[PDB]
Amino acid sequence: QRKRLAEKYRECLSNKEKILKEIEVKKEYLSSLQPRLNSIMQASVQ
Amino acid sequence: QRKRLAEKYRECLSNKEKILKEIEVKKEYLSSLQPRLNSIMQASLPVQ
């Protein structure tokens, strides 16, 4: 049981690192999207 | 009275010419803004 809990805790650490990687990259993507939106607004009679 | 009627007819013709110039300006503005919106969308699609 201590083996199972240690391995599952290492798997949860890897999943938390993946969630953080998703989030970091996701945040960067969101920032890029915001810049694109700003560019579109600048491009934008009406 | 005939001179005043001729002046009123000239003012009405000037108002009709101004309305025709405004309609032509609106048509030219739409025709220019069509390709301008096309270029703006083509510029926005590269940024997207």
SS (H, E, C) A1-46: CHHHHHHHHHHHHHHHHHHHHHHHHHHHHHHHHHHHHHHHHHHCCC
Give the determination technique: cryo-EM
Residues of chain A with C-beta less than 8 angstroms from the C-beta of B29: 45
Handedness of CA B22, B25, B31, B36 (dihedral sign): negative
Residue to test with chain B: of A39, A41, A46, most B Cβ within 10 A: A39
Exposed, middle or buried: residue A30 (CB in 10 Å: 0-12, 13-18, 19+)?
A: exposed
Q: Considering only CA atoms, which of A29, A32, A17, A11 is closest in space to residue A3?
A: A11
Distance of CA A11 to the CA centre of its chain: 19
Distance of CA A17 to the CA centre of its chain: 11
Residue A46 distance to chain B (closest CA, Å): 9
The resolution in Å comes to 3.5
